[PDB]
């Protein structure tokens, strides 16, 4: 079972729509959650015109029912200081449902 040792700020961006059918993201902070972060094999990735530096980073938080603020959704992101962990999906580790699997990237531009 996980050792939730690291503190991560959950961040949901409120989506103000613009004129052309898109939205605007500002990323205000939601509450702070504790989670363990487990790195996978990391390597460079050909970005757009950047040489990014990605790592898999499976993140384990505690769970919640789906209509609650303590559930990280995949449109959210984590942040430890200035390290932006994205969220790819959440996936319910245990059989009983105590913990979740977040999946990050944390791609600094290298």
């Amino acid at each position: 079972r996980p050792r939730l040792n690291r503190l991560l700020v959950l961040e949901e961006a409120v989506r103000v729509a613009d004129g052309a059918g898109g939205h605007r993201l500002d990323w205000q902070a939601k509450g702070e959650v504790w989670a363990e972060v487990t790195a996978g094999s990391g390597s460079e990735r050909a970005g757009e015109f950047v040489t990014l530096a990605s790592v898999p980073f499976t993140i384990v938080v505690r769970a919640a029912p789906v209509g609650a603020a303590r559930r990280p959704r995949p449109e959210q992101r984590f942040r430890e200081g200035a390290r932006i962990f994205r969220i790819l999906a959440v996936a319910e580790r245990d059989r009983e449902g105590h913990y979740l699997s977040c999946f990050a990237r944390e791609e600094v531009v290298a």
């Binding site: 505690r62 769970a63 029912p65 209509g67 009983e96 449902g97 105590h98 913990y99």
Partner: protein, 192 residues
């Protein structure tokens, strides 16, 4: 010595609402209807009131026995007792004549015992065995229980719910380590 109970517990006194707050709340998914859960708490109360010889909801019993053990005794088996209602003393056919004096109930968690006044206890006719109706248990509700005994019901009824047949999976204060202090500790296997 039979000790059947008078009335079963209604189910509206059992915490089927507080059991699912133990079962899936805080961590999990906000699964089964109340008739499935209530079949597991009373299947876990009756597993712990049999291992610890308790009653836990304080329903009424009837102990009908044919011979007293001593003449100043006959400890009652269900442990937390209060307010022995009547000492009926039937004859053969049984016009069913009660007695109303001679004994004192001694409320004691160790030996709930009936301890007649003096040295003589009400004797039994030929064939007309004596019955005792008493109301043993902690409290009428669920909030009157000792909480470690009420937790071990929830730790066990969540075991009967979350795994159905006799399959595989000890923690420090488990189910056994919580009900080990409510069990009856006796070391007389002898004549008296």
């Amino acid at each position: 010595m039979m000790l059947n109970e008078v009335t079963a517990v209604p189910g509206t006194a059992l915490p089927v609402a507080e059991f699912r707050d133990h079962l899936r709340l805080g961590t999990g998914f906000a699964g089964a209807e109340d008739a499935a859960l209530l079949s597991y708490l009373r299947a876990a109360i009756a597993a712990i009131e049999g291992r610890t010889a308790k009653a836990l909801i304080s329903r009424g019993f009837r102990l009908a026995l044919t011979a007293w053990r001593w003449g100043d005794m006959q400890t009652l088996p269900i442990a937390p007792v209060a307010t022995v209602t009547a000492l009926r003393l039937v004859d053969a056919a049984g016009v069913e004549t009660p007695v109303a004096a001679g004994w004192r109930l001694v409320p004691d968690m160790a030996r709930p015992r009936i301890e007649a006044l003096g040295a003589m206890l009400p004797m039994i006719p030929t064939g007309g065995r004596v019955e005792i109706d008493f109301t043993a248990g902690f409290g009428a509700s669920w909030s009157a229980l000792p909480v470690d005994l009420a937790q071990a019901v929830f730790l066990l009824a969540a075991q009967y719910y979350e795994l159905r047949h006799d399959g595989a999976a000890a923690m420090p204060f488990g189910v056994m380590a919580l009900i080990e202090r409510w069990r009856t500790v006796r070391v007389l296997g002898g004549r008296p």
